[PDB]
Amino acid sequence: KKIFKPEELRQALMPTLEALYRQDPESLPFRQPVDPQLLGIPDYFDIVKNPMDLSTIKRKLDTGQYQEPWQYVDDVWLMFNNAWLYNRKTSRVYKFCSKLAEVFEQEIDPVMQSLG
Numbered sequence: 001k002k003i004f005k006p007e008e009l010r011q012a013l014m015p016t017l018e019a020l021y022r023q024d025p026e027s028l029p030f031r032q033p034v035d036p037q038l039l040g041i042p043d044y045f046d047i048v049k050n051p052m053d054l055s056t057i058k059r060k061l062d063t064g065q066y067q068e069p070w071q072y073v074d075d076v077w078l079m080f081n082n083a084w085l086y087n088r089k090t091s092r093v094y095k096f097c098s099k100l101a102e103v104f105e106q107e108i109d110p111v112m113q114s115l116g
Ligand SMILES: CCOc1ccc(C(C)=O)cc1-c1cc(NC(=O)c2ccco2)cc(-c2c(N)noc2C)c1
Pocket: 025, 028, 029, 030, 031, 032, 033, 034, 035, 038, 039, 041, 082, 083, 086, 087, 092, 093
């Protein structure tokens, strides 16, 4: 894979991550890792093998852990897929996940087009 400059990835992709943070209350379940003890859901790590959340993605962006932009896009979708997998279709977190995924699709859209 071709490697991008971490500072360049941050400048192109961080605004799309901040667009998710701005969603209130839709982003609230996603701003910190799922704490199954705090939330009363002990089976969470039985079902979600690769947890992901906004804070981890932001950390990976801030410390240059992504070599190329589709790794960022992979983590965002991992975050959303975890939530669609774990939560019931009738629940508020599922709805929030679908709202947030919509905002993301709009934003990531011209950004990846400008990185090619
Ligand atoms: C039992 C349901 O809770 C979840 C269930 C599943 C998931 C995911 C991602 O699969 C997230 C939350 C969740 C929801 C919220 N926020 C809500 O608004 C909410 C919860 C319930 C009613 O409203 C905040 C947090 C959270 C966090 N990430 N860090 O501290 C806290 C507190 C987590």
